[PDB]
Amino acid sequence: MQFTPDSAWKITGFSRDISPAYRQKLLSLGMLPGSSFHVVRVAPLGDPVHIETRRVSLVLRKKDLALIELEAVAQ
């Protein structure tokens, strides 16, 4: 349920009213719904985490993740 710095995940930014600010932004990276990324650091209360993508490190927020969807890799 929680996100710890060790496991992998997949980017699926798809909300019910996701604003273009976040959507039109990711476009610059070329990471559309269905990408793969790793976790650098996360907190159970609420902290700033960083994702590891194809030769690119993006930063996310425990509150920001609330909008974008995530999909755990294949165990």
Side-chain angles (χ1 to χ4, degrees):
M1 181 64 182
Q2 306 172 30
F3 299 90
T4 51
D6 58 271
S7 179
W9 306 86
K10 298 176 178 178
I11 303 181
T12 312
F14 178 91
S15 309
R16 299 71 165 177
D17 58 270
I18 182 176
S19 60
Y22 297 100
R23 181 65 180 201
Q24 183 182 330
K25 172 186 301 299
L26 299 182
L27 301 182
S28 60
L29 301 180
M31 298 295 176
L32 290 61
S35 180
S36 180
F37 73 102
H38 299 93
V39 181
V40 180
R41 64 174 58 191
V42 189
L45 180 64
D47 286 64
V49 46
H50 306 253
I51 61 179
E52 300 295 80
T53 61
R54 298 301 184 179
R55 299 179 61 194
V56 180
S57 180
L58 183 60
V59 64
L60 298 182
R61 299 177 177 195
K62 182 90 301 191
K63 53 175 172 296
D64 181 88
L65 284 70
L67 301 179
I68 61 182
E69 193 176 88
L70 300 178
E71 178 180 89
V73 296
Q75 299 299 270

Coordinates of all heavy atoms in Angstrom, one line a residue:
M1 N 0.8 -1.2 0.0 CA 0.0 0.0 0.0 C 0.9 1.3 0.0 O 0.6 2.2 -0.7 CB -0.9 0.0 1.2 CG -1.8 1.2 1.3 SD -3.0 1.3 -0.1 CE -3.8 2.8 0.3
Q2 N 1.9 1.3 0.8 CA 2.8 2.4 0.9 C 3.9 2.3 -0.1 O 4.1 1.3 -0.7 CB 3.4 2.5 2.3 CG 2.4 2.5 3.4 CD 3.0 2.4 4.8 OE1 4.1 2.8 5.1 NE2 2.2 1.8 5.8
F3 N 4.6 3.4 -0.3 CA 5.7 3.5 -1.3 C 7.0 3.7 -0.6 O 7.3 4.8 0.0 CB 5.4 4.6 -2.3 CG 4.2 4.5 -3.1 CD1 3.0 5.0 -2.6 CD2 4.2 3.8 -4.3 CE1 1.8 4.8 -3.4 CE2 3.0 3.6 -5.0 CZ 1.8 4.2 -4.6
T4 N 7.8 2.7 -0.6 CA 9.2 2.7 0.0 C 10.3 2.8 -1.0 O 10.1 2.2 -2.1 CB 9.4 1.5 0.9 OG1 9.1 0.3 0.3 CG2 8.5 1.6 2.2
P5 N 11.4 3.4 -0.7 CA 12.5 3.5 -1.6 C 13.3 2.2 -1.8 O 14.3 2.0 -1.1 CB 13.4 4.6 -0.9 CG 13.1 4.5 0.6 CD 11.6 4.1 0.6
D6 N 12.8 1.4 -2.7 CA 13.4 0.1 -3.0 C 12.6 -0.6 -4.0 O 13.2 -1.3 -4.9 CB 13.5 -0.7 -1.7 CG 12.1 -0.9 -1.1 OD1 11.7 -0.1 -0.2 OD2 11.5 -2.0 -1.4
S7 N 11.3 -0.6 -4.0 CA 10.5 -1.2 -4.9 C 10.3 -0.4 -6.2 O 10.6 0.8 -6.2 CB 9.1 -1.5 -4.3 OG 8.3 -2.2 -5.2
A8 N 9.8 -1.0 -7.3 CA 9.6 -0.3 -8.5 C 8.1 0.0 -8.7 O 7.2 -0.6 -8.1 CB 10.1 -1.1 -9.7
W9 N 7.8 0.9 -9.7 CA 6.4 1.2 -10.0 C 6.3 1.7 -11.5 O 7.3 1.9 -12.1 CB 5.9 2.3 -9.1 CG 6.1 1.9 -7.6 CD1 7.2 2.1 -6.8 CD2 5.1 1.3 -6.8 NE1 7.0 1.6 -5.6 CE2 5.7 1.1 -5.5 CE3 3.8 0.9 -7.0 CZ2 5.0 0.6 -4.4 CZ3 3.1 0.3 -5.9 CH2 3.7 0.1 -4.7
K10 N 5.1 2.0 -11.9 CA 4.9 2.5 -13.2 C 4.0 3.7 -13.2 O 3.0 3.8 -12.5 CB 4.2 1.4 -14.1 CG 5.0 0.1 -14.3 CD 4.2 -0.9 -15.0 CE 5.1 -2.2 -15.2 NZ 4.4 -3.3 -15.9
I11 N 4.4 4.7 -14.0 CA 3.7 6.0 -14.1 C 2.4 5.9 -14.9 O 2.4 5.4 -16.0 CB 4.6 7.1 -14.7 CG1 5.9 7.3 -13.9 CG2 3.8 8.4 -14.8 CD1 6.8 8.3 -14.5
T12 N 1.3 6.3 -14.3 CA 0.0 6.2 -14.9 C -0.8 7.4 -14.6 O -2.0 7.4 -14.2 CB -0.8 4.9 -14.5 OG1 0.1 3.8 -14.6 CG2 -2.0 4.7 -15.4
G13 N -0.2 8.6 -14.8 CA -0.9 9.9 -14.5 C -2.2 10.0 -15.2 O -2.3 10.4 -16.4
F14 N -3.3 9.6 -14.5 CA -4.6 9.6 -15.1 C -5.6 9.9 -14.0 O -6.1 9.0 -13.3 CB -4.9 8.3 -15.8 CG -6.3 8.3 -16.4 CD1 -6.6 8.7 -17.6 CD2 -7.4 7.8 -15.6 CE1 -7.9 8.7 -18.2 CE2 -8.7 7.8 -16.1 CZ -8.9 8.2 -17.4
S15 N -6.0 11.1 -13.8 CA -7.0 11.5 -12.8 C -8.3 11.8 -13.4 O -8.5 11.7 -14.7 CB -6.5 12.7 -12.0 OG -5.2 12.5 -11.6
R16 N -9.3 12.3 -12.6 CA -10.6 12.6 -13.1 C -10.7 14.1 -13.6 O -11.6 14.4 -14.4 CB -11.7 12.4 -12.0 CG -11.7 11.0 -11.5 CD -10.5 10.6 -10.7 NE -10.7 9.4 -9.9 CZ -9.8 8.8 -9.1 NH1 -8.6 9.3 -9.1 NH2 -10.1 7.7 -8.5
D17 N -9.7 14.9 -13.1 CA -9.7 16.3 -13.5 C -8.3 16.8 -13.6 O -8.0 18.0 -13.4 CB -10.5 17.1 -12.6 CG -10.0 17.0 -11.1 OD1 -10.5 16.1 -10.4 OD2 -9.1 17.8 -10.7
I18 N -7.3 15.9 -13.9 CA -5.9 16.2 -13.9 C -5.7 17.5 -14.8 O -6.1 17.6 -15.9 CB -5.1 15.1 -14.6 CG1 -3.6 15.5 -14.6 CG2 -5.6 14.8 -16.0 CD1 -2.7 14.4 -15.1
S19 N -5.1 18.5 -14.2 CA -4.8 19.8 -14.9 C -3.7 19.6 -15.9 O -2.9 18.7 -15.8 CB -4.5 20.9 -13.8 OG -3.3 20.5 -13.1
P20 N -3.7 20.5 -16.9 CA -2.7 20.5 -18.0 C -1.3 20.8 -17.4 O -0.3 20.3 -18.0 CB -3.2 21.5 -19.0 CG -4.0 22.4 -18.2 CD -4.7 21.6 -17.1
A21 N -1.2 21.6 -16.4 CA 0.0 22.0 -15.8 C 0.9 20.8 -15.5 O 2.1 20.8 -15.8 CB -0.2 22.8 -14.5
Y22 N 0.3 19.7 -15.0 CA 1.0 18.5 -14.7 C 1.0 17.6 -15.9 O 2.0 16.9 -16.1 CB 0.4 17.8 -13.5 CG 0.4 18.6 -12.2 CD1 -0.7 19.3 -11.7 CD2 1.6 18.6 -11.4 CE1 -0.7 20.0 -10.6 CE2 1.6 19.3 -10.2 CZ 0.5 20.0 -9.8 OH 0.5 20.7 -8.6
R23 N -0.1 17.5 -16.6 CA -0.1 16.7 -17.8 C 0.8 17.2 -18.9 O 1.7 16.5 -19.4 CB -1.6 16.6 -18.3 CG -1.8 15.7 -19.5 CD -1.5 14.3 -19.2 NE -1.7 13.4 -20.4 CZ -1.8 12.1 -20.3 NH1 -1.9 11.5 -19.1 NH2 -2.0 11.4 -21.4
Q24 N 0.5 18.4 -19.4 CA 1.3 19.0 -20.5 C 2.7 19.1 -20.1 O 3.6 19.2 -21.0 CB 0.7 20.4 -20.8 CG 1.4 21.1 -22.0 CD 0.9 22.5 -22.2 OE1 -0.2 22.8 -22.0 NE2 1.8 23.3 -22.7
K25 N 3.1 19.0 -18.8 CA 4.4 19.1 -18.4 C 5.2 17.8 -18.7 O 6.2 17.8 -19.3 CB 4.5 19.4 -16.9 CG 5.8 19.3 -16.2 CD 5.8 19.4 -14.7 CE 5.2 20.8 -14.3 NZ 6.0 21.9 -14.9
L26 N 4.7 16.7 -18.1 CA 5.3 15.3 -18.3 C 5.6 15.1 -19.8 O 6.5 14.4 -20.2 CB 4.4 14.2 -17.8 CG 4.1 14.3 -16.3 CD1 3.2 13.1 -15.9 CD2 5.4 14.3 -15.5
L27 N 4.8 15.7 -20.7 CA 4.9 15.5 -22.1 C 6.4 15.9 -22.5 O 6.9 15.3 -23.5 CB 4.0 16.4 -22.9 CG 2.5 16.1 -22.6 CD1 1.6 17.0 -23.4 CD2 2.2 14.7 -22.9
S28 N 7.0 16.9 -21.8 CA 8.3 17.3 -22.1 C 9.3 16.2 -21.9 O 10.4 16.1 -22.5 CB 8.7 18.5 -21.2 OG 8.6 18.2 -19.9
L29 N 9.0 15.3 -21.0 CA 9.9 14.1 -20.7 C 9.6 13.0 -21.6 O 10.4 12.1 -21.8 CB 9.7 13.7 -19.2 CG 10.0 14.8 -18.2 CD1 9.8 14.3 -16.8 CD2 11.4 15.3 -18.4
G30 N 8.4 12.9 -22.1 CA 8.0 11.8 -23.0 C 7.5 10.6 -22.3 O 7.5 9.5 -22.8
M31 N 7.1 10.8 -21.0 CA 6.7 9.7 -20.2 C 5.1 9.7 -20.1 O 4.6 10.3 -19.2 CB 7.3 9.8 -18.8 CG 8.8 9.7 -18.8 SD 9.4 8.0 -19.3 CE 11.1 8.3 -19.3
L32 N 4.5 8.9 -21.0 CA 3.0 8.8 -21.0 C 2.6 7.7 -20.2 O 3.3 6.8 -19.8 CB 2.6 8.6 -22.5 CG 2.7 9.8 -23.4 CD1 4.2 10.2 -23.5 CD2 2.1 9.6 -24.8
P33 N 1.3 7.7 -19.8 CA 0.7 6.7 -18.9 C 1.1 5.3 -19.3 O 0.8 4.8 -20.4 CB -0.8 6.9 -19.1 CG -1.0 8.3 -19.4 CD 0.3 8.8 -20.1
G34 N 1.9 4.6 -18.5 CA 2.4 3.3 -18.8 C 3.9 3.2 -18.8 O 4.5 2.4 -19.5
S35 N 4.6 4.1 -18.0 CA 6.0 4.1 -18.0 C 6.5 3.4 -16.7 O 5.7 3.0 -15.8 CB 6.5 5.5 -18.0 OG 7.9 5.6 -17.9
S36 N 7.8 3.3 -16.6 CA 8.5 2.6 -15.5 C 9.4 3.6 -14.7 O 10.1 4.3 -15.4 CB 9.2 1.4 -15.9 OG 9.9 0.7 -14.8
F37 N 9.4 3.5 -13.4 CA 10.2 4.4 -12.6 C 10.5 3.7 -11.2 O 9.8 2.8 -10.8 CB 9.5 5.7 -12.4 CG 8.4 5.7 -11.5 CD1 8.5 6.2 -10.2 CD2 7.1 5.2 -11.9 CE1 7.4 6.1 -9.3 CE2 6.1 5.2 -11.0 CZ 6.2 5.6 -9.7
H38 N 11.6 4.2 -10.6 CA 11.9 3.7 -9.3 C 11.8 4.8 -8.2 O 11.7 6.0 -8.5 CB 13.4 3.2 -9.3 CG 13.6 2.1 -10.3 ND1 14.0 2.3 -11.5 CD2 13.4 0.7 -10.1 CE1 14.1 1.1 -12.2 NE2 13.8 0.1 -11.3
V39 N 11.7 4.3 -6.9 CA 11.6 5.3 -5.8 C 12.9 5.5 -5.1 O 13.7 4.6 -4.9 CB 10.6 4.7 -4.8 CG1 10.4 5.7 -3.6 CG2 9.2 4.4 -5.4
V40 N 13.2 6.8 -4.9 CA 14.4 7.2 -4.2 C 14.2 7.3 -2.7 O 15.0 6.8 -1.9 CB 14.9 8.5 -4.8 CG1 16.2 8.9 -4.1 CG2 15.1 8.4 -6.3
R41 N 13.2 8.0 -2.3 CA 12.9 8.2 -0.9 C 11.5 8.7 -0.7 O 10.9 9.5 -1.4 CB 13.9 9.3 -0.3 CG 13.7 10.7 -0.9 CD 14.5 11.7 -0.2 NE 15.9 11.4 -0.2 CZ 16.9 12.0 0.5 NH1 16.5 13.0 1.3 NH2 18.1 11.6 0.4
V42 N 10.8 8.1 0.3 CA 9.4 8.4 0.6 C 9.2 8.4 2.1 O 9.9 7.8 2.9 CB 8.5 7.5 -0.1 CG1 7.0 7.9 0.1 CG2 8.8 7.3 -1.5
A43 N 8.1 9.1 2.6 CA 7.7 9.2 4.0 C 6.3 8.7 4.2 O 5.4 8.9 3.3 CB 7.9 10.6 4.5
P44 N 6.0 8.1 5.3 CA 4.7 7.6 5.6 C 3.7 8.7 6.0 O 2.5 8.5 5.9 CB 4.9 6.6 6.8 CG 6.1 7.2 7.5 CD 7.0 7.8 6.4
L45 N 4.2 9.8 6.4 CA 3.4 11.0 6.8 C 3.2 11.9 5.6 O 2.1 12.3 5.4 CB 4.1 11.7 7.9 CG 3.3 12.9 8.4 CD1 2.0 12.5 9.0 CD2 4.1 13.7 9.5
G46 N 4.2 12.2 4.9 CA 4.1 13.1 3.7 C 5.4 13.8 3.5 O 5.7 14.8 4.1
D47 N 6.2 13.4 2.5 CA 7.4 14.0 2.1 C 7.6 14.0 0.6 O 6.9 13.4 -0.1 CB 8.6 13.3 2.8 CG 8.7 13.6 4.3 OD1 7.7 13.2 5.0 OD2 9.7 14.2 4.7
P48 N 8.7 14.8 0.1 CA 9.0 14.9 -1.3 C 9.8 13.7 -1.8 O 11.0 13.5 -1.3 CB 9.8 16.2 -1.4 CG 9.9 16.7 0.0 CD 9.6 15.5 0.9
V49 N 9.3 12.9 -2.7 CA 10.0 11.8 -3.2 C 10.4 12.0 -4.6 O 9.9 12.9 -5.3 CB 9.1 10.5 -3.2 CG1 7.7 10.8 -3.7 CG2 9.7 9.4 -4.0
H50 N 11.4 11.3 -5.1 CA 12.0 11.4 -6.4 C 11.9 10.1 -7.2 O 12.2 9.1 -6.7 CB 13.4 11.9 -6.3 CG 13.6 13.2 -5.5 ND1 13.9 14.4 -6.1 CD2 13.6 13.3 -4.2 CE1 14.0 15.3 -5.1 NE2 13.9 14.7 -4.0
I51 N 11.5 10.2 -8.4 CA 11.4 9.1 -9.3 C 12.5 8.9 -10.3 O 13.0 9.9 -10.8 CB 10.0 9.1 -10.1 CG1 10.0 10.3 -11.0 CG2 8.8 9.1 -9.2 CD1 8.8 10.4 -11.9
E52 N 12.9 7.7 -10.5 CA 14.1 7.4 -11.4 C 13.6 6.9 -12.7 O 13.1 5.7 -12.8 CB 15.1 6.5 -10.8 CG 15.7 7.0 -9.5 CD 16.5 8.2 -9.7 OE1 15.9 9.3 -9.8 OE2 17.8 8.1 -9.7
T53 N 13.7 7.7 -13.8 CA 13.2 7.2 -15.1 C 14.4 7.1 -16.1 O 15.6 7.2 -15.7 CB 12.2 8.2 -15.7 OG1 12.9 9.5 -15.9 CG2 11.0 8.4 -14.8
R54 N 14.1 6.8 -17.3 CA 15.1 6.6 -18.3 C 16.1 7.8 -18.3 O 15.9 8.8 -19.0 CB 14.5 6.4 -19.7 CG 13.6 5.2 -19.8 CD 14.4 3.9 -19.5 NE 13.5 2.7 -19.8 CZ 14.0 1.5 -19.6 NH1 15.2 1.3 -19.2 NH2 13.2 0.5 -19.8
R55 N 17.2 7.6 -17.6 CA 18.3 8.6 -17.5 C 17.7 10.0 -17.1 O 18.1 11.0 -17.7 CB 19.0 8.7 -18.9 CG 19.7 7.5 -19.3 CD 20.4 7.6 -20.7 NE 21.4 8.7 -20.6 CZ 22.0 9.2 -21.7 NH1 21.6 8.8 -22.9 NH2 22.9 10.2 -21.6
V56 N 16.7 10.0 -16.2 CA 16.1 11.2 -15.8 C 15.5 11.1 -14.4 O 14.8 10.1 -14.1 CB 15.0 11.7 -16.8 CG1 14.4 13.0 -16.3 CG2 15.6 11.9 -18.2
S57 N 15.8 12.0 -13.5 CA 15.3 12.0 -12.2 C 14.3 13.1 -11.9 O 14.6 14.2 -11.8 CB 16.4 12.1 -11.2 OG 16.0 12.0 -9.8
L58 N 13.0 12.7 -11.8 CA 11.9 13.7 -11.6 C 11.5 13.7 -10.1 O 11.7 12.6 -9.4 CB 10.7 13.4 -12.5 CG 9.6 14.4 -12.3 CD1 10.1 15.8 -12.7 CD2 8.4 14.0 -13.2
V59 N 11.0 14.8 -9.6 CA 10.5 14.9 -8.2 C 9.0 14.9 -8.1 O 8.3 15.5 -8.9 CB 11.1 16.1 -7.5 CG1 10.6 17.4 -8.2 CG2 10.8 16.1 -6.1
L60 N 8.5 14.2 -7.1 CA 7.0 14.1 -6.9 C 6.7 14.4 -5.5 O 7.6 14.4 -4.6 CB 6.5 12.7 -7.3 CG 6.7 12.3 -8.8 CD1 6.1 11.0 -9.1 CD2 6.1 13.4 -9.7
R61 N 5.4 14.6 -5.2 CA 4.9 15.0 -3.9 C 3.8 14.0 -3.5 O 2.9 13.7 -4.2 CB 4.4 16.4 -3.8 CG 5.5 17.4 -4.2 CD 5.0 18.8 -4.2 NE 6.0 19.8 -4.4 CZ 5.8 21.1 -4.2 NH1 4.7 21.6 -3.7 NH2 6.8 22.0 -4.4
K62 N 3.9 13.5 -2.2 CA 2.9 12.6 -1.7 C 1.5 13.1 -2.0 O 0.6 12.3 -2.2 CB 3.1 12.5 -0.2 CG 2.1 11.5 0.5 CD 2.6 10.1 0.5 CE 3.0 9.6 -0.9 NZ 3.3 8.1 -0.9
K63 N 1.3 14.4 -2.1 CA 0.0 15.0 -2.4 C -0.2 14.9 -4.0 O -1.4 14.8 -4.4 CB -0.1 16.4 -1.9 CG 1.0 17.3 -2.3 CD 0.8 18.7 -1.9 CE 2.0 19.6 -2.1 NZ 3.2 19.1 -1.3
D64 N 0.9 15.1 -4.7 CA 0.8 15.1 -6.2 C 0.4 13.7 -6.7 O -0.3 13.6 -7.7 CB 2.1 15.6 -6.8 CG 2.1 15.6 -8.3 OD1 1.7 16.6 -8.8 OD2 2.5 14.6 -8.9
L65 N 0.9 12.7 -6.0 CA 0.7 11.3 -6.4 C -0.8 11.0 -6.3 O -1.3 10.1 -7.0 CB 1.5 10.3 -5.6 CG 3.0 10.2 -5.9 CD1 3.7 11.5 -5.5 CD2 3.6 9.0 -5.2
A66 N -1.5 11.7 -5.5 CA -2.9 11.5 -5.3 C -3.7 11.6 -6.6 O -4.7 10.9 -6.8 CB -3.5 12.5 -4.3
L67 N -3.2 12.4 -7.5 CA -3.9 12.6 -8.8 C -3.4 11.5 -9.8 O -4.2 10.7 -10.3 CB -3.6 14.0 -9.4 CG -4.0 15.2 -8.5 CD1 -3.7 16.5 -9.2 CD2 -5.5 15.1 -8.3
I68 N -2.1 11.5 -10.0 CA -1.6 10.5 -11.0 C -1.7 9.1 -10.4 O -1.6 8.9 -9.2 CB -0.1 10.8 -11.3 CG1 0.7 10.7 -10.0 CG2 0.1 12.2 -11.9 CD1 2.2 11.1 -10.2
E69 N -1.9 8.1 -11.3 CA -2.1 6.7 -10.9 C -0.8 6.0 -11.0 O 0.1 6.4 -11.8 CB -3.1 6.1 -11.8 CG -3.6 4.7 -11.3 CD -4.7 4.1 -12.1 OE1 -4.4 3.4 -13.1 OE2 -5.9 4.3 -11.8
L70 N -0.6 4.9 -10.2 CA 0.6 4.1 -10.2 C 0.3 2.7 -10.3 O -0.8 2.2 -9.9 CB 1.4 4.4 -8.9 CG 1.8 5.9 -8.7 CD1 2.5 6.0 -7.4 CD2 2.7 6.3 -9.9
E71 N 1.2 1.9 -11.0 CA 1.0 0.5 -11.1 C 2.3 -0.3 -10.8 O 3.3 -0.1 -11.4 CB 0.6 0.2 -12.6 CG 0.4 -1.3 -12.8 CD 0.0 -1.6 -14.3 OE1 0.9 -1.8 -15.1 OE2 -1.2 -1.7 -14.5
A72 N 2.2 -1.1 -9.7 CA 3.4 -1.8 -9.3 C 3.9 -2.8 -10.4 O 3.0 -3.4 -11.1 CB 3.1 -2.6 -8.0
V73 N 5.2 -3.0 -10.5 CA 5.7 -3.9 -11.5 C 5.2 -5.3 -11.3 O 4.4 -5.6 -10.4 CB 7.3 -3.9 -11.4 CG1 7.8 -2.6 -11.7 CG2 7.7 -4.4 -10.0
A74 N 5.7 -6.3 -12.1 CA 5.3 -7.7 -12.0 C 6.2 -8.5 -11.1 O 7.3 -8.8 -11.5 CB 5.3 -8.3 -13.4
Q75 N 5.7 -8.7 -9.9 CA 6.5 -9.5 -8.9 C 6.8 -10.9 -9.4 O 6.0 -11.5 -10.1 CB 5.7 -9.6 -7.6 CG 5.4 -8.3 -7.0 CD 6.6 -7.5 -6.6 OE1 7.1 -7.6 -5.5 NE2 7.1 -6.7 -7.5

